Symmetry: D2
Subunit: 289 residues, 4 copies
Amino acid sequence: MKKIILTIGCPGSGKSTWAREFIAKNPGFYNINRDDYRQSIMAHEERDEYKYTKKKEGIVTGMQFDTAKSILYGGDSVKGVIISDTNLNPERRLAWETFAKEYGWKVEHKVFDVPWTELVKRNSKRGTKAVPIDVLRSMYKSMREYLGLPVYNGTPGKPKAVIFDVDGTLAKMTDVINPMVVELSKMYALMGYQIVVVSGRESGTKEDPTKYYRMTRKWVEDIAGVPLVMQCQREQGDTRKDDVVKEEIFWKHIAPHFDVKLAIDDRTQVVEMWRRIGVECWQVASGDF
Amino acid sequence: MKKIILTIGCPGSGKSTWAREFIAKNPGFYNINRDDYRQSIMAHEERDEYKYTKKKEGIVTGMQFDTAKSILYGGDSVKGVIISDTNLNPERRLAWETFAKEYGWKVEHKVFDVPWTELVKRNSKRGTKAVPIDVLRSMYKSMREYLGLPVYNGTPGKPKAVIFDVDGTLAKMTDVINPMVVELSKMYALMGYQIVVVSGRESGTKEDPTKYYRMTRKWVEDIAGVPLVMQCQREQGDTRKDDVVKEEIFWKHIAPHFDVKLAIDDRTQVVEMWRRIGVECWQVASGDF
Amino acid sequence: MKKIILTIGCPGSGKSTWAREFIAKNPGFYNINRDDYRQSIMAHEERDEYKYTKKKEGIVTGMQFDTAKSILYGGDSVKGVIISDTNLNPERRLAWETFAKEYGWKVEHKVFDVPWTELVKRNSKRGTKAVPIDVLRSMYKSMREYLGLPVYNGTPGKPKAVIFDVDGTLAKMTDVINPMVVELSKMYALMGYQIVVVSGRESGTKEDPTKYYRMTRKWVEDIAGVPLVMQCQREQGDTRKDDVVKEEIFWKHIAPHFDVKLAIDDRTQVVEMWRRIGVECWQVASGDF
Amino acid sequence: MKKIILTIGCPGSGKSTWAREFIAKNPGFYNINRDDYRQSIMAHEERDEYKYTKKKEGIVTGMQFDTAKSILYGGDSVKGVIISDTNLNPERRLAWETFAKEYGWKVEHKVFDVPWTELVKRNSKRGTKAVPIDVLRSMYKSMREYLGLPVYNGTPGKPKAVIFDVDGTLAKMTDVINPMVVELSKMYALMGYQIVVVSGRESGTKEDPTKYYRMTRKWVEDIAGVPLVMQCQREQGDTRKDDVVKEEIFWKHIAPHFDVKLAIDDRTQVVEMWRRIGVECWQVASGDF
Ligand SMILES: [Ca+2]
Ligand SMILES: [Ca+2]
Ligand SMILES: [Ca+2]
Ligand SMILES: [Ca+2]
């Protein structure tokens, strides 16, 4: 049975580099792509900015299926076709499976799951064919939904709480307290909120695995006076992205003991994470690092 | 007297497009540029990512002055040279004036002041030679300092206050209140803070110039219950960027009656503005629109 | 009646620059193109070299008509479509007219006739999407056939003859004779051939309109000893390409009095011309100027 | 002693791809290049066509040595510099050795000898930064002079002769004779010239190593009636370029028994070869294959 391969990825994920790579080695497959159709029918030049239209889209979609059927109804040399689109919308993925249903073709998937941070890096350098930051975020959001990744919906029972970062949030860089924010934690203290403190600093070093955890705990507790309830920090020896560390700490140490209602941070890649998993977050300062 | 033209702009401002344009029409001038030297001495290809080095920089700087003196000490056909760099660091601008001092050349300036928002648009589409978002912000920050633009340092006397946006901040889009944030305004109400409300919505329409100001004032005051003290909104008929509107409203209506200690918003271009002028700001949600 | 515009041109003629230009101003038309389809179905990157296949072509053609019918059978907003291909093969042009026949659409033409020399200039600088020199020549050859331009088939009656250029052919640059070639003219003298001499040098200058014609005639006749029968040269004040001058001189002064059986030259652009119009030609030296 | 590496190659030879490759692995070296300086001082954009000037050149040269001395008189970390230019002019190569002489640096060479045919292939696809065909030929001509490759100056003693190709020269493609050319051989027969015939066709096949040599010899001798004196053809099993085959046959079988005064061919790559080695050649037809 001839196959129809759908690539599943956000722009910059690797879909195309793969499609060409593949097709080159597997003579028999052929590439079909929206971006290409979108540019060709406008005779656009690489540096042009395509304008969105419901009309042009229909056209483009039509061009896809028609070419699909048209290349899949050829010589017994045709192994199948690749749809190197983002394919992140489900109603669209379904559309393909149904279409391949009433013609006798199977549908396969080739995923290109790349970390948010890496997608952003490439996007910015995509240039013209780059994609706005707000659409990349949504894309990735749909990719998380396709992968099944979790979204925190709360925690019935346990007390509500606000999370605070240390570097750049409560502290400004033996640094000095960031007034307005430290006050915040103390105001959420009045209200009746539990205050969990968090930090991406390594707990300590090889020989003193808590050197920094201790130095931080001291600071927070004796210079900032943050009435915390629980403090968490990156374990010594962890070289994974801040992105990933704080999520893991949230799920394994926070989520199951608190009803998180807010998170305060400054680092963009972290703030971006809190919001994906379903946790409101306020960035207290420009943090593009 | 031969001249040495320094272009003053952030990347994407227009420096180079101008330099080539100019030189083409004014036979006699010659271009000198860091970026070019930085790429040539590494034999880099357009798509390569140059790595920063204090050593390589020295080299590059040396290449500049040497070529400067070398092209300015030529035939009486040489009108002068253009330094198409960002030239935003002052210690560097001075260096040129002193150098041109001890050789008999005058220093001229050609400014390319482009709105932040426009710089960001182009940067993202610059591709490889694009520049990280954090360095663009600093660049622009230096450009504001060179232009003399104001930076709010506070207001001795008048009462302290926090500013709140409406669309997407206090309200989520007859929309519904955004819980955590509306609570914030009320908590800053306890403390003893004056709460100024702000909005980029047009006050009203041609015939009803306050239709929206009224609809907003009602909402804020009777559904959100925000104990504001002053409400400001974009005057009907204003088609300038949100960026620009709220700054103007700040300087002409807020700054002179309040000691602003914080601003709450969600729209990135606005949050970016509050911080340039020296006003802490917390983004309560992803707002890349 | 909806229209289907076929652009007629060799690559580099201007087809695409026009299509985009047009479509931008005439909202309603849409671009369809082989090159685009050829690259998309291979997921090729700009710098890749497509490999020709009878199979892939069929595919591409199918993609054209299908999209043609598919975009021409849409909303009453669709004015028509543009086929920005070379469309130089007639069997192909016919195919379109017949197709548009059995659907109710008219076929229009938009020609982009550019001089050979200019096509070659652009081609070389086309880079990757450039086209081999032998295919450009054929293309252009088909364009001449579409324009109706003449092809010399001979001249029944008048005596046979060989044409010789002067600069770089009979003479090497008061220059000195090019031995082997001057001998040639004299050998074609034995055989029984009439020898017509030709030159792209201006006959003379403003005030002495024959200064060079005379200087040449002297040389040819008294240092080279070429037993010519007729000498022709570029009239003083003619700034048109050598290409064009010698063709005009051929048709208006040579073709009607001689049965040309060969032409000797060295300048590529001229040799290229002699052969298009149906005249054998031998290049006696590298002449890429 | 610090080194100054001169790359020796025609454009497209590989100089730059190598320089970047090298420098990346050998931290300590730095690239200096004319092309870069030539573009930077005009603020040209990739797609611009630089205009040659004796003035701008001086500038560029000055920029080289100055940067050379300037980067070679730095920290003990500087291993040396690479001059990724064509460096094909000798007066220029000398200039470097003398310069590095009066400063204490040694001069090294890194050659990039690529076949003519391959240089032409890449050039055409170089695009903007491509180089005219006439300058490539000269470049390569200088490269042959630097490599020491031979240039035939004649053969005192042995009889003079003209060489003729078969495919496309004497024959037009059991093909049919090309009238005007076959007549030529017979006319050079009168004069008193020896006629050597040559062919790039394989002599024969695996089992019949002369099948084609015989078929050709028959044709030439009994249908064209060419009064040859010696026939040479590509030995069965030789898959090297026509370019290379005929040169080898010339040096090992022709040059030492004849005083070649002309060669007739049609294939461009072959005609290009005859002329490099110092043998006049006439292309009888467009042969870009
Ligand atoms: Ca932080
Ligand atoms: Ca808002
Ligand atoms: Ca000539
Ligand atoms: Ca041949």
